[PDB]
Amino acid sequence: ANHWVLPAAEFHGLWDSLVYDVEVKSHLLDYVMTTLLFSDKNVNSNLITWNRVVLLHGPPGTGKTSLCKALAQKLTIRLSSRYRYGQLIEINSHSLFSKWFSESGKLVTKMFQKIQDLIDDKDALVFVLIDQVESLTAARNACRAGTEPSDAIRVVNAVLTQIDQIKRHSNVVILTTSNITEKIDVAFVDRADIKQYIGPPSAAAIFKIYLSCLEELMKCQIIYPRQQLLTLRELEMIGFIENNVSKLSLLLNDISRKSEGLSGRVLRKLPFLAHALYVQAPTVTIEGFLQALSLAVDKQFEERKKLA
Amino acid sequence: PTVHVEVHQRGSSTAKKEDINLSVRKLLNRHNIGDYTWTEFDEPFLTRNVQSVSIIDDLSACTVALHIFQLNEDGPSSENLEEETENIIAANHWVLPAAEFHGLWDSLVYDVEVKSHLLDYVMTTLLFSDKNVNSNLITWNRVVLLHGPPGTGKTSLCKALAQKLTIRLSSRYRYGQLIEINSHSLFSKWFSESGKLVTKMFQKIQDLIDDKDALVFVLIDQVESLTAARNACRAGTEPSDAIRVVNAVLTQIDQIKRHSNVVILTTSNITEKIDVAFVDRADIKQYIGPPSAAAIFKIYLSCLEELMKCQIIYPRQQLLTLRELEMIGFIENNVSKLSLLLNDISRKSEGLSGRVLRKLPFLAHALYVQAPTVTIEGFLQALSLAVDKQFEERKKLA
Amino acid sequence: PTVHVEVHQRGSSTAKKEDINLSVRKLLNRHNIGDYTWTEFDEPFLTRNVQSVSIIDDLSACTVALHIFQLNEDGPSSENLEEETENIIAANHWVLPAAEFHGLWDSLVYDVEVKSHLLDYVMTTLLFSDKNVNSNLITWNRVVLLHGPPGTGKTSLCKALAQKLTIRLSSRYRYGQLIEINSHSLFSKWFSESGKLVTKMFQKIQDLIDDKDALVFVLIDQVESLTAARNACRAGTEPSDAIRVVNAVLTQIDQIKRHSNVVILTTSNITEKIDVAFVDRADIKQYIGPPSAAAIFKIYLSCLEELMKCQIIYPRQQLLTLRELEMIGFIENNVSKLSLLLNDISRKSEGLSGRVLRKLPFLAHALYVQAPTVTIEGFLQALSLAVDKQFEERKKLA
Amino acid sequence: RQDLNFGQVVADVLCEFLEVAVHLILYVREVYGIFQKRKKYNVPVQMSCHPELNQYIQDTLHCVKPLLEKNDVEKVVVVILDKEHRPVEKFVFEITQPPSHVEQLLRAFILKISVCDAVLDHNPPGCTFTVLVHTREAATRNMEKIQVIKDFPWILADEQDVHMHDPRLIPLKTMTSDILKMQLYVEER
Ligand SMILES: Nc1ncnc2c1ncn2[C@@H]1O[C@H](COP(=O)(O)OP(=O)(O)OP(O)(O)=S)[C@@H](O)[C@H]1O
Ligand SMILES: Nc1ncnc2c1ncn2[C@@H]1O[C@H](COP(=O)(O)OP(=O)(O)OP(O)(O)=S)[C@@H](O)[C@H]1O
Ligand SMILES: Nc1ncnc2c1ncn2[C@@H]1O[C@H](COP(=O)(O)OP(=O)(O)OP(O)(O)=S)[C@@H](O)[C@H]1O
Known part of the structure; x- marks a missing residue:
């Protein structure tokens, strides 16, 4: 299993960069807020x-692991009153x-003695990222x-019951x-209550x-040409009218409309x-760069239509 | 207007790299001038060391870069990714390209400049890694x-890519590699134990990669037998352990991204049948057809x-390529009717896999010639008969 | 116009090769002689040495080197593959020319010249191999x-050939072989382990192949079991497992692409149901119908x-052949009645495979008119009825 | 219709069953008093409290568990032996392997090795064990398959720990099975 003490040098640009327009990020935020507040409030589950x-x-490839990691970061910094720090555990089922x-019983037992040693101090907020749950069903x-x-079903079941063993305390969160x-055949589908859908x-x-x-x-x-681009708030207050200063924004907005539903990871590559294939130059001007990006989004769509 | 020129120098010689560099440099200064190659050299030392020089695409001497390479003659060095308990071949680890890969790029011929696409893609990879562009x-x-x-060249293109990339990046990287992983x-x-073996295999790959100069192209030729x-x-x-190896493979590939000198040709x-998590993890899902x-x-x-x-x-003749056939006016003045018949065969031979095209x-010679020596028009009409019979064989097999 | 001659030399005889070469020169060039065969008579010593002399398709101005051969009288040699407790013969192994396959290549009759193409394929393979044409x-x-x-003579042409070639290619390749593969x-x-020992079997075939005088003939019957x-x-x-074997055969069919002493008859x-990456690797893809x-x-x-x-x-009578029958003009005479009537029986029995044509x-002597010695005057009719029976035996089967 | 492949555990579980066995036998053979009575595999197994010795077994067996998975192993022998490294109690697990019945009859095994202290005479305490891995290849061929473990090294068939003798077999078991011919027997000396 992996381990992260606290959001490190690899854990800022994601949440500062992961961008969904349904504001699901705020949704995850206040959902977890409600969960923790009810838990310390001792409300009854029945x-x-x-x-x-x-x-x-x-x-x-839409951010789920990056979203989980950045969410752990955001929650552990936001909760600046109960937990001084957090712990992120990535348990690999392999x-x-x-x-x-x-042998496997003693191995998983040792792993969860380590986990119990970790959680014994309730000072922190601990996560677990069961990466893929379908590898247990x-x-x-x-x-x-x-x-x-x-040797296969017994071990995975002895892990599934230890999941409910760990989940019993009051500062744990389960992410998958x-x-x-x-549906999922494990007891993380019906019994799960925060089931947020992520798409393109x-x-x-x-x-x-x-x-x-x-x-x-x-x-x-x-x-080379450091030209200034304008946030979407600017294109909406201006009235979407062309001029000599806010045209690049217009072209890029048409591009954004054309690139609706590819993916998260792809719209980042x-x-x-575009620079690799359609620019063929060591330094570029943004004006032709946007046209190259147009050719690249057309190419990506053509490929995804070309795989039959 | 960069123009690349690469010279194959005979493995017998041992002259210092820069001396032969300046020697072929004044060779070009003697020539000062289309993709062309020579083997009929004049200077004695030039003959003793270099075997051939090649110009690869009316630009006389605007700018040229010179690459020198030493073809190896020994085969791949096999390796057993096991504790020697069970004797099973694991990967045919090559070295800087062997003489078997020579001429491979020239043999493969593709419709519209895909070859160049992969070329500048890897060039761009190193170029962006040079400017220290932020990873996240x-x-x-x-x-x-x-x-x-x-039969379109896809298990003949990864090796040729290894070849020409190790040739071109010779100025930046001393030697390349290649690891054709055996999936089965x-x-x-x-x-x-499949999970235990996959991590050991890719850990060996990482060990081989550790030399930050050493270029490594992993080659997984049959991923659909692996994913x-x-x-x-x-x-x-x-x-x-059937969908328990796909996850480990994906995890290790996502791990390998943080190393500067890696390509993964598949x-x-x-x-x-491949996957949904893979068929979207590849940059250039390039499609190669007939x-x-x-x-x-x-x-x-x-x-x-x-x-x-x-x-x-028997008799040597001259065949004008297509771009000369454009300028001639396609006239029937007894100089280029042979190339015209060859073009007709090229026209009617559409759709063949391109492996049958070399076959x-x-x-044609075997079936319809029954002689050990022929003229040119007989062989052309025999090739026409052969393509027709290949069509008939495709029809009768349904 | 070269015409070939095969001479069967008994296993009893021991006279050295070239001695019987010169003896058969004395023989053939005292007779000074489309296909007409003679037995080992007309001289004492060769009667003690040879068995039969046969010519294959008039003055014979240019003759061939006599193809002189002893049949081996030992059949298959079962060769298991598993390290422990194989208990299943994985590959039968003849050493051609074996005894059983004798006369097999001559019984089979095709009137479409499949033998000619399938024969010259190997001759041209040799022609391109010896003069060193580039692989790429x-x-x-x-x-x-x-x-x-x-049932049309597809397994009987994949074995009657792996003998005929060893007879033809005796001067070059000095003993043939034949490996019959037990797919199951x-x-x-x-x-x-489903592919991890297909690789082992092809490894064993390769190990047999290294001896550069052998002429290995790998044979796969009913390929659909394997691909x-x-x-x-x-x-x-x-x-x-059945996704990773069909592309384990294909990665071995091309690792034995470089040798020139191998053929793979299938x-x-x-x-x-044959995978399409195999239906294209094939080099002839021949169709033989009823x-x-x-x-x-x-x-x-x-x-x-x-x-x-x-x-x-009953006491035998002579029969006429289509050439003589067309030469005489189909006239009803003292001998032609049998020829014409057998011609009608032939002209009635099309559409049936070879198996039924030989049953x-x-x-016709087992069901219909039975008297341990039967005259041809009647027996031909006793065959005709049987023919109709088969057609009736189809209709009731719908 | 779904025909389908199989997922054998065949060669490995044996030694780790030996693990249980040895953790039992190290107890029963009176060669462990730092052992404790515990519960595992629905029997009164007697194991060791030391996690340090648990990891020592992890090295000794669970490192060679896929290395012992070669089927060349003939006699997995727990030589119960004095300082000279020569047996008094040859727990010869003669693994005549024809490649939950395994624990169905190792129920008898564990249970009867537990009863073996009613058959085993009073073996002197202060005597250790060696895991003699009798292969089909003599004199420790292929050092790699036996020294697979990096931190845990192996040794060749040196003259001392290669031989045994005094084979008086009272076959406390002869528990043939489907995958296993666990011809365990306690050859006294
Ligand atoms: N909408 C997105 N917005 C911003 N960055 C993204 C987005 N999607 C992906 N990224 C980044 O691109 C990479 C995608 O990898 P992951 O986030 O790990 O995808 P994933 O959650 O693992 O999806 P699967 O189901 O496991 S394949 C990551 O480095 C992300 O940080
Ligand atoms: N453009 C081309 N013109 C002529 N021949 C070509 C061309 N490209 C490839 N070939 C031939 O194709 C052969 C290589 O075939 P591969 O691409 O390796 O087949 P493959 O794709 O591995 O086959 P599979 O696995 O069944 S999809 C070489 O020997 C070349 O001679
Ligand atoms: N053209 C033919 N003329 C006469 N007999 C033939 C002919 N073709 C096949 N036979 C008979 O075929 C008998 C052998 O049958 P097989 O050839 O085993 O059939 P097959 O043709 O092998 O078809 P399969 O695949 O094995 S169905 C031979 O002994 C021949 O008598």
């Missing part, structure tokens, strides 16, 4: 249901299966017609990514992604892609 | 993925030239 | 695929000659 489990799902039970679907179940929208960013997020990308390309003079 | 605000994982019908030798009869459809291969249960005949009429013309030109060289065909001269 | 510029993978309706041993219930199409469905049907009758009228007449001629030699028939005398 009449009103509340669990410390949050599940994230949607197409693959490395737990030994040859047979009597596929091994359970093979009770017949597969490997020796005594699934990437299927129908909308047309208003392509602008904010692209401006940050172009700024980063500005930082080291890859694009597109400037590099 | 913009990033890219290296994975390339080539897909299409069978990664799993195990015991369960939970089974993660949801589809769960209905009708496989064992535990090929696939079947796309509907070559067009011009590419087919260049293919047949290379074939006929080679047969003229080896004397399978076809041999098949 | 012209290449071919050595695979032969044969398909058609069931390659698969395995275990997790990843079933990759896209069946997403379910557990055809588990993940058979299949349901083509639509025989036509002339082939039928020749088959019946062979059967009748064999019986009246074996005396399951038919046995059934």
Whole structure:
């Protein structure tokens, strides 16, 4: 399993950069706020249901792990009154299966003695990121017609019950990514209550992604002419009227509209892609760079239509 | 207006790199001048060290960069990614390109400048890594993925890319590498050992990569035999470690992105079966199909030239390429009707996989010549018969 | 116009090779002699040495080097592959020319010249191999695929050839071989051992191949058992193992692409289940259908000659061949009645495969008129009825 | 219709079953008093309280558990032995392997090795064990498959720890099984 003491030098640009227009980020924020406030409030679960489990799902490569990591960062800094710091644990399901039970049981037992040592001090806020949960139900679907179940199903079940063992305290949060929208055979689908859907960013997020990308390309003079671009608030107060100063914004807005639903990770690789193929120059002017980006979004759409 | 020129110098010689550099430099200063290559040298020392010099695309001497390379003659050094308990081959680790890969780029002929696309893509990769561009605000994982019908060059393009990249980056990197991972030798009869083997394999890859100058192109030729459809291969249960290797592979590839000198060339005949988490993790999901009429013309030109060289065909002739055939006016003045017939064959030979396209001269000669030596028009009409019979064979097999 | 001669030299005889070469020169050039064969008579010592001399398609001004051979009288040699407890013969192994395959290549009758193409393929392979044509510029993978309706002489042409060649290519290649592959041993219930020993079997074939005088003839019967199409469905049907074998054969069919002492003869009758990355690697892809009228007449001629030699028939009478029959003008005479009537029987029995065409005398003497010695005046009619029976035996089967 | 492959645990579990076994036998053979009575595999297994010795077994066996998975192993022998490294109690797990029944009959195994102290005479305390891995290749062929573990090294078949003798077998078990021919037997000396 991985481990993060606190949002490090790799943990700012994500949340400062992940951009969705449904403001699901604020939604995750206040959902977790409600969860923690109810928990310290000692409300009873039977009449009103509340669990410390949050599940994230949607197409693959849309931010779910980055969203979980940045969310952990944001919650551990925001909660500046109860927990002085947090702990992020990324439990990989792969490395737990030994040859047979009597080894894997001791291994998982040692891992969760370490986890209990960590949680014993309730000073901090601890997370767990079970990366993929479907890797624990596929091994359970093979009770017949597969490997020796005594060594596969038993271990995953002895992990699934230890999940409920850990979840029992009052400063734990459970985060997972699934990437299927129908149901999950593990007890993290029906029993989960914060099940937020993530999809491709909308047309208003392509602008904010692209401006940050172009700024980063500005930082080291890859694009020579340092021209000033304007935040979407400017294009909406101006009235969307063309002039000599806010035209690049117009072209980039048309681009953002054309690039609606590709992905999160892909809309971040597109400037590099456009520069690689369609620019063929060591330094570029933004005016032709935007046309190259147009050709690149057209190319990406053409490819995704070309894979049959 | 950068123009690249690369010189193959014979492995027997041992002259110092910069002395032969300046020698071929005044060679160009003697020439001062289309992609052309020489082997009929004049200067004695020039003859003793270099075997050939090649110009690769009316620019006389605007600017040239010079690359010198030493073809290796020993085969791949196999490796067993195991504790020697079970003898199974793991990867055919190559070295700076062997003589087997020579001429490979020239053999492969593609319709519309895809070759250059991968070229400047990797060039851009290093270029952006040079300006210290911040990783998080913009990033890219290296994975390339080539897909299409069978026989289009996709398991013949990754090796040639290794070749020319190790040739071109010679000024920046002393040696390249290549690791053709053997996908079938990664799993195990015991369960939970496939995960143990994949991490050891890619850990060995990382060890090989650690030399920040050492260029490494991992080659996974049959990813669809390594990345089974993660949801589809769960209905009708496989064992535990079927969609438990895809995740580890994905994790290690996402890990490899933070190393400056890596490419990951992958090929696939079947796309509907690879993945959903992979078929979107590749930068250039490049599609290579059957070559067009011009590419087919260049293919047949290379074939006929080679047969003229080896004397399978007795009288040497001259065949005008397409760009000369444009200027001649396509007249019938007994100088270029042979190239016109070859163009007709190129026209009617559309859709063939491009592997059959190299096969076809041999098949034509075998079946319809029954002689050990021929003229040119006989071989052309035999090739026409061969393409027709290939069409008939495709029809009768349904 | 070169015409070939094969001479069968007994296993009893011990006279050295060249001695019998010169002896057969004395023989043939004292007779000074489309296909007419002689036995080992007309001289004592050669009667002690040779068995038969046969010519294959008039003054014979330019003759061939005599192809003189001893049949080996030891059959298959089972060779297991598993390290422990194989218990399943994975590959039968003849050393040609074996005893059983004798006369096989001459019984088979095709009137479409499949033998000519499938023969000259190897001759041209040798021609391009010896004069050293570059692999990159012209290449071919050595695979032969044969398909058609069931039972038409597809496994009997993939074995009658692996002998005929060793007879033809005796001067160059000094002993042939033949490996019959037991596909169903390659698969395995275990997790990843299904391809991890296909590679082992092709490794063993390679180990047999290194001896540069051998002329290995790998044979795969009913390929669909080995290269079933990759896209069946997403379910557990055809588990993940059956995606990774079909592309484990294909990564070995091309690692033995470089040798010139190898051919891979393969058979299949349901083509639509062979993966399409194999249906393109094949170099000839030949289709052999049920025989036509002339082939039928020749088959019946062979059967009748064999019986009246074996005396399951009354005092024998001579029969006429299509050439002589057309030469005489189809006139009803003291001998032609049998020829014309057998011609009608042939002209009636089209559409049937070879198996039934060769059973038919046995059934026609097993069910219909039975008297241990039967005259040809009646027996031909006793065959005709049987023919109709088969057609009736189809209609009731719908 | 779904035909399907299999996922054997065949060769590894044995040694780690030996783990339980050895953790039992190190107890029962009276060669461990730092052992404690515990519960595992539905039997009164007697294990060790030291996690340090648990990781020592992790090294000794659970490092070679996929390395012992070669099927060449003939005799997985717990040599119960004095300072000279020569047996008094040859727990010869003669693994005649024909490649939950395994614990169904190792129920008898564990249970009867537990009863073996009613058959084992009073073996002197202060005597340790060695795991003699009898392979099909003599004199420790292929050092790699036995020294797979990096931190835990292996040694060749040096003259001392290679031989045994005094084979009086009272076959406390002969528990043949499906995957296993666990011809365990306690060859006294
Ligand atoms: N909408 C997005 N906005 C801003 N940055 C993004 C976005 N999507 C992806 N990124 C970045 O691009 C990379 C995508 O990788 P991940 O966030 O880990 O995707 P994921 O959650 O793992 O999806 P799967 O189902 O596991 S394939 C990450 O480095 C993200 O930080
Ligand atoms: N443009 C081209 N013109 C002529 N021949 C070509 C061309 N491209 C490739 N080839 C031939 O194709 C061969 C390489 O085939 P591959 O691309 O490796 O087949 P493959 O894609 O691996 O086949 P699979 O695995 O069934 S999809 C070389 O020997 C070339 O001679
Ligand atoms: N053209 C032919 N003329 C006469 N007999 C033939 C002919 N073709 C095949 N046969 C008979 O075929 C008998 C052998 O049957 P097989 O050839 O095994 O059939 P097959 O043709 O192998 O088809 P499969 O794949 O094995 S269905 C031979 O002994 C021949 O008698």
